[PDB]
Amino acid sequence: MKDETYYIALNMIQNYIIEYNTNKPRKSFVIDSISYDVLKAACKSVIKTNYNEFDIIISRNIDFNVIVTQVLEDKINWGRIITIIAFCAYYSKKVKQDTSPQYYDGIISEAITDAILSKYRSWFIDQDYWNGIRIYKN
């Protein structure tokens, strides 16, 4: 359900995707700013390294939620989480509507949150939520 854990996950992911799309700082809207900055830097690295591959992936008739659930079907780790968020941020900006400021941050962030918490809620809590991402600080 949509409990505290759900919002701890969702609020981090959705604020990052908003920042990526709008180029406005969103760290002050999350509780864990240190881990947000780690997430942001790690996604930036993934995108810089792999955007051409992402471009080929997105040129096809894709459902992003199938992609997300495929990554997490059998196991989770922080590199996987970072790569999902990075890909999905990159995707969101590419699929933004021309005639509205709709970049689908709601459905995309909720899908990522649900894919994490449907099978890995105890793992996430045991990581102390986003604290476990700090192993990727620089």
Binding site: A42, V66, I67, T69, N77, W78, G79, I84
Partner: peptide, 22 residues
């Protein structure tokens, strides 16, 4: 890449490599 390699499979490899690199 072969169309038999699922897209999530490709992103999982990126993520597991990211762990190694960092």
């Amino acid at each position: 890449i072969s169309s038999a390699i699922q897209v999530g499979h490709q992103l999982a490899l990126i993520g597991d490599e990211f762990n190694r690199a960092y």
